[PDB]
Amino acid sequence: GDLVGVNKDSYLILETLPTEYDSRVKAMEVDERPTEQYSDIGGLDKQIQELVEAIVLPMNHKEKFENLGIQPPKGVLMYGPPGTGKTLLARACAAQTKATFLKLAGPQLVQMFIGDGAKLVRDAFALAKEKAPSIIFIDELDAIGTKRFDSEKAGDREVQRTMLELLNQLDGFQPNTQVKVIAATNRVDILDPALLRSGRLDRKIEFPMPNEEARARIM
């Protein structure tokens, strides 16, 4: 399965090229880090900490978890009303961290041809593993995480396979433990029950509207 170059006329292996990734998957790796300090976010203090201690701290203090023998939590789902600060924390957490920040999207893993969606998910996780500690952010998870649906006379399973490949890639037949997954959603009722397990995205944070003081700092 390795990629090897071959002489054009007398076919013969000459070099072993580096593994190739889909051009789409390489364009989702952030190179210009966003500039948004944690002090920019207001009100979400009990939730910003809960994320930094599940996606950033376990990446710099590995000596601490291994001392107590607790596998670090896998995944952080962020849900809440339309606009509360979900993407601000993700963008901010992409600034105070010296690690790859593979930035996925929602509608984007969806592709017309059969199996093209799986490629962009397997390739989006192999690339993160191929690099140093990485955080893979999947924003707008509704488009690829709608609840599975039984039916005859037409339906939609092309998108469902992409989700099924995301499910197994996150936690299935392989205990990958260096790629951290952050997900953003504003409608958790529609998500497939399989995507809200404990092995998959684990720390399901609730982002509430500012009450009476967050609106003061927010301004």
Ligand X SMILES: Nc1ncnc2c1ncn2[C@@H]1O[C@H](COP(=O)(O)OP(=O)(O)OP(=O)(O)O)[C@@H](O)[C@H]1O
Ligand Y SMILES: Nc1ncnc2c1ncn2[C@@H]1O[C@H](COP(=O)(O)OP(=O)(O)O)[C@@H](O)[C@H]1O
Binding-site positions for ATP read 80-87
Q: Is 130 helix (H, G, I), strand (E, B) or coil?
A: helix
Nearest distance from residue 70's CB to ligand X, in Å? 13
**Which two three-digit tokens encode residue 100?**
């790859």
Instruction: Out of 146, 147, 159, 186, name the contact with other proteins by CB under 8 A.
Output: 147
**Which two three-digit tokens encode residue 133?**
């500690």
Q: Considering beta carbons, is residue 36 or 165 the nearer one to ligand X?
A: 165
For the chain, where are the alpha helices, taking DSSP H only? 23-26, 45-51, 57-60, 62-68, 86-93, 116-130, 158-170, 214-218
**What is the pattern of x (binds ligand X, CB under 6 A) and - over residues 151-190?**
--------------------xx------------------
Nearest residue to 176 via CA among 125, 121, 139: 125
Nearest distance from residue 41's CB to ligand X, in Å? 32
Q: Which amino acid is at 66?
A: E
Residue 138 engages ligand Y in binding (rule: CB under 6 A)? no
Sign of the torsion angle spanned by Cα atoms 167, 192, 157, 108: negative
Nearest residue to 103 via CA among 31, 159, 167, 19: 31
**What is the pattern of x (binds ligand Y, CB under 6 A) and - over residues 29-58?**
------------xxxx--------------
The site for ligand X (CB under 6 A) is made up of 171-172, 197, 199
Residues in contact with other proteins by CB under 8 A are 45-46, 53-54, 64-65, 67-73, 79, 113-116, 118, 122, 147-148, 153, 157, 160-161, 164-165, 167-168, 172-173, 188-189, 193-194, 196-199, 202-204, 211-213
